[PDB]
Amino acid sequence: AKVKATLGEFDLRDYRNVEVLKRFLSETGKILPRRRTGLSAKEQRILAKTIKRARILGLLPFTEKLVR
Amino acid sequence: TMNITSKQMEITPAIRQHVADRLAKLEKWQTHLINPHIILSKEPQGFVADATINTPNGVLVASGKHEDMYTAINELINKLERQLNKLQHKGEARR
Amino acid sequence: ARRRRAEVRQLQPDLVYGDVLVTAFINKIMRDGKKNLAARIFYDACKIIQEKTGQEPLKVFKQAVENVKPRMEVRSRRVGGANYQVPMEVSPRRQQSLALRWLVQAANQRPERRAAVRIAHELMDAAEGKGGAVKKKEDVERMAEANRAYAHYRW
Amino acid sequence: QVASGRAYIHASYNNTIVTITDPDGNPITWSSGGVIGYKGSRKGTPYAAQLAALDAAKKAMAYGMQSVDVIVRGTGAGREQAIRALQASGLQVKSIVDDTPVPHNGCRPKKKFR
RNA sequence: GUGGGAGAGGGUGGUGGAAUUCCCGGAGUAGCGGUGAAAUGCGCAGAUACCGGGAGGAACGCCGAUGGCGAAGGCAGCCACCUGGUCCACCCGUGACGCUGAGGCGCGAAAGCGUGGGGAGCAAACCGGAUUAGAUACCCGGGUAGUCCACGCCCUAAACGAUGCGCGCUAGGUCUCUGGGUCUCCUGGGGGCCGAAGCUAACGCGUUAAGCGCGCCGCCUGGGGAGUACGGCCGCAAGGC
Ligand SMILES: [Mg+2]
Ligand SMILES: [Mg+2]
Ligand SMILES: [Mg+2]
Ligand SMILES: [Mg+2]
Ligand SMILES: [Mg+2]
Ligand SMILES: [Mg+2]
Ligand SMILES: [Mg+2]
Ligand SMILES: [Mg+2]
Ligand SMILES: [Mg+2]
Ligand SMILES: [Mg+2]
Ligand SMILES: [Mg+2]
Ligand SMILES: [Mg+2]
Ligand SMILES: [Mg+2]
Ligand SMILES: [Mg+2]
Ligand SMILES: [Mg+2]
Ligand SMILES: [Mg+2]
Ligand SMILES: [Mg+2]
Ligand SMILES: [Mg+2]
Ligand SMILES: [Mg+2]
Ligand SMILES: [Mg+2]
Ligand SMILES: [Mg+2]
Ligand SMILES: [Mg+2]
Ligand SMILES: [Mg+2]
Ligand SMILES: [Mg+2]
Ligand SMILES: [Mg+2]
Ligand SMILES: [Mg+2]
Ligand SMILES: [Mg+2]
Ligand SMILES: [Mg+2]
Ligand SMILES: [Mg+2]
Ligand SMILES: [Mg+2]
Ligand SMILES: [Mg+2]
Ligand SMILES: [Mg+2]
Ligand SMILES: [Mg+2]
Ligand SMILES: [Mg+2]
Ligand SMILES: [Mg+2]
Ligand SMILES: [Mg+2]
Ligand SMILES: [Mg+2]
Ligand SMILES: [Mg+2]
Ligand SMILES: [Mg+2]
Ligand SMILES: [Mg+2]
């Protein structure tokens, strides 16, 4: 279930877009690994940098509790 | 109690109580030394001292060998001490 | 028993009640191979089991055996630096064996002078739930239980 | 007197503690492996967690508690057993959430943990 | 020179959340904590577990990698500024302007030192509890320097790839990071693995050589005595060369 396919053509590097970015976080809030996001290396970097900006802005979380 | 066998040798009350005294070193560990038995013996190279002892946690067996009889006996106790500290501490690897 | 599984012998059923459980018992009464002896005791007791408390000595015997077999027992493992008494169920094999053993053992500690009487009475009481044997059972079983929380170290 | 409320499970390697709260999160009653007759490492066991979670729910039911959400903290031997035991309590277990706290690489741990 | 790229390279300011500790308010009761098992310790003077509020310091989870960057030491939340190194393309400028490098100069982990801040967590020394024959330890409960910041010193190391720098030459296979191309692939620069030849005492090395060659520098010459003594230079001392 690879994520870059689960979504269209986008801008990773756009920190305001919470609907795209939310997909790249796990259920627990963690930045998902390449093994999931399907980003390349260079990509996955730009991802995490911008995810992080967004979480400072209040948009994406930092942690989330795990619901069973 | 403690028995000493001087094999093919003419031993003495004095050196007997000396070996009783050297063996006393193992009393250090405070563990029952059951019917200990030393054997003193000549040999062309030098003397030989054997001892075989059972304790609640196992048995000690060892041979000392040397020119001087007394250094043979010491060697014997030195070897016995090691064996005794090992029976006493061995499973403490209980993590 | 390193190698395979250790066969449990079956046993010739007895020449009075035709039931294996009796010979095992008689076997447990036996001492120094003298089996004829081991027999009369059981049967003599069986005289007494009818004489007093008129009933079916077979019934009484087979009852007090089920009144003895321990359902749960402790068997102790070394873990780390302490030896834990551990709760485990007894095999039907082992329960029989523990049944018969405590029965006799407790029998022979009774104050009765004549052996078969001792056997008579111990069985009559165990049928009812009273005696040295029964205790040993209930005992072993409270010693399990209370260890219930060591039931995870269980093989 | 509250029917809806919360169960907090504190599960360490040493013990298991259950505290039941109001919906606001104020303790109604609590229990631990120690509250049952266990001392030493026996407190740590899953059986102990169970016995503790029961007694906690039990006590809670006397204040008329029926529904709880269950909140779980720590990695214990008794973690799962406590969860189980509340479900078999007669309490409703309206949910289960893991809140176990974790540093984003915080304070230096005691030497044991390095 | 022009034009592009990747990066935890360095310095300065600022800034976010998780967590630990403490304090305050609430609610609650008989234990919590800890170990191999315990005890010291904390707790009815209300602890632990739970909720709200506050203070403060340090380190930055996921991403994260066998990854990246740096001459080495070493460098990791996020933002901006100042700034070094380095790679690719174009084949445009100069015209051997190179290589190495005794001395010199500068950088140099941790610990340590000075002056002044700061101090949550951790923790030499130190105090207890256990373990043990004993236990000036390992394990447990406490705990001060220090760990953090500024400035100034110290100059060490298993400071390691135990492998000095530059250049040229000598099969390939595989996966990986980062460029450029007419994109199965081709091709530079880097990080790994397996291996031609060849090397090696063996282990192993092998276009990231320990192969084949040139240049320059450093170093070795049996073990201990000893990185000691003496002299000298350096340092506040420790102590370094
Ligand atoms: Mg405990
Ligand atoms: Mg920086
Ligand atoms: Mg800053
Ligand atoms: Mg309070
Ligand atoms: Mg009071
Ligand atoms: Mg709080
Ligand atoms: Mg690396
Ligand atoms: Mg290094
Ligand atoms: Mg030209
Ligand atoms: Mg020209
Ligand atoms: Mg120089
Ligand atoms: Mg330094
Ligand atoms: Mg320092
Ligand atoms: Mg110093
Ligand atoms: Mg000092
Ligand atoms: Mg200082
Ligand atoms: Mg100071
Ligand atoms: Mg302090
Ligand atoms: Mg002393
Ligand atoms: Mg001490
Ligand atoms: Mg300590
Ligand atoms: Mg401490
Ligand atoms: Mg303090
Ligand atoms: Mg290394
Ligand atoms: Mg060197
Ligand atoms: Mg050099
Ligand atoms: Mg390469
Ligand atoms: Mg490099
Ligand atoms: Mg190789
Ligand atoms: Mg070859
Ligand atoms: Mg190659
Ligand atoms: Mg070589
Ligand atoms: Mg020499
Ligand atoms: Mg010497
Ligand atoms: Mg030195
Ligand atoms: Mg010197
Ligand atoms: Mg000098
Ligand atoms: Mg001077
Ligand atoms: Mg000083
Ligand atoms: Mg040197």
Q: What structural domains and CATH numbers belong to chain D? A: 1-114 (3.30.420.80)
D114 touches strand E (CB under 7 A): no
For A39, the domain range is 1-68
Question: Nearest CA to D96 among A68, A64, A27?
Answer: A68
φ and ψ of C17, to 5 deg: -100, 0
Residue A5, min C-alpha distance to chain D (Å)? 30
What's CA B88's distance to the chain center, in Å? 16
DSSP chain B: --EEEEETS---HHHHHHHHHHGGGGGGG----EEEEEEEE--SS-EEEEEEEEETTEEEEEEEEESSHHHHHHHHHHHHHHHHHHHHHSTT---
Superfamily of the domain at C1-155: Ribosomal protein S7/S5 (1.10.455.10)
Using DSSP's 3-state secondary structure scheme, residue C154 falls into coil
CB C31 within 8 A of CB C38: yes
How far, in Å, is the centroid of ligand 6 from the Cα of D92?
Answer: 28
What's CA B14's distance to the chain center, in Å? 17
User: Residue D76 burial (CB < 10 Å; 0-12/13-18/19+)?
Assistant: buried
D36 touches strand E (CB under 7 A): no
How many domains is chain A built from? 1
A6 touches strand E (CB under 7 A): no
Q: How many CB atoms lie within 10 A of CB B23?
A: 20
CA–CA separation, A12 and C110 (whole Å) = 90
CA of D28 to C1' of E47 (A): 17
DSSP A14-53: -TT-HHHHHHTB-TTSPBPPHHHH---HHHHHHHHHHHHH
For residue C13, what is the DSSP state? P
Task: Decide the pairing of beta strands D67-73 and D4-11.
Answer: parallel
Q: How large is the angle between the packed helices C92-107 and C20-29, nearest 10 degrees?
A: 50
Structure-determination approach: X-ray
CA of D38 to C1' of E96 (A): 88
- Where are chain C's structural domains? 1-155
CA of A43 to C1' of E3 (A): 24
Task: Please name the amino acid found at residue C101.
Answer: R
- Contact check, Cβ <8 Å, C151/D42: no
CA–CA separation, B49 and B43 (whole Å) = 11
Nucleotides of E under 7 A from a protein CB: 6-8, 15-20, 26-39, 48-52, 57-65, 67, 77-79, 120-123, 131-134, 139-141, 176-179
Using DSSP's 3-state secondary structure scheme, residue A2 falls into coil
The residues, ordered by sequence, that sit 6+ positions from C128 with a Cβ below 8 Å of its Cβ are none
Residue D15, min C-alpha distance to chain C (Å)? 13
User: Residue C143 burial (CB < 10 Å; 0-12/13-18/19+)?
Assistant: middle
Q: Distance from first CA to last CA of chain D, Å, rounded?
A: 46
The residues, ordered by sequence, that sit 6+ positions from C57 with a Cβ below 8 Å of its Cβ are C45, C46, C49, C50
Pairs of residues, one from chain B and one from chain C, whose beta carbons lie less than 8 Å apart? 3
Residue that has been written with the tokens 């976080």 in this structure: A25
User: What is each CA distance from D64 to A29, D9, D28, D95, in whole angstroms?
Assistant: 36, 20, 11, 19
How far, in Å, is the centroid of ligand 34 from the Cα of B74?
Answer: 23
CA–CA separation, D89 and D85 (whole Å) = 6
Residue A8, min C-alpha distance to chain D (Å)? 32
User: Residue C98 burial (CB < 10 Å; 0-12/13-18/19+)?
Assistant: buried
CA of D81 to C1' of E79 (A): 47
CATH of the domain at A12: 4.10.640.10
What's CA B87's distance to the chain center, in Å? 15
User: What is each CA distance from B40 to B54, B71, B79, C63, C104, in whole angstroms?
Assistant: 19, 12, 16, 67, 54
Residue C79, min C-alpha distance to chain B (Å)? 8
Closest residue in D to C153 (Cα–Cα): D45
CA–CA separation, A58 and A18 (whole Å) = 10
Q: How large is the angle between the packed helices C115-128 and C35-51, nearest 10 degrees?
A: 50
User: What is each CA distance from B33 to B3, B38, C99, D62, in whole angstroms?
Assistant: 12, 13, 41, 64
CB B40 within 8 A of CB B9: yes
Beta-bridge partner residues of A25: A31
CA–CA separation, B70 and C13 (whole Å) = 71
Nearest nucleotide (C1') to the CA of residue A64?
Answer: E18
Q: How many CB atoms lie within 10 A of CB A13?
A: 12
A63 touches strand E (CB under 7 A): yes
B/A Cβ contact: 3+ pairs below 8 Å? no
What's CA B59's distance to the chain center, in Å? 12
Tokens of B3: 């028995």
Q: Distance from first CA to last CA of chain A, Å, rounded?
A: 21
Tokens of C116: 């078969």
Q: Is C3 on the interface with D (CB under 8 A)?
A: no
CA–CA separation, C58 and C49 (whole Å) = 9
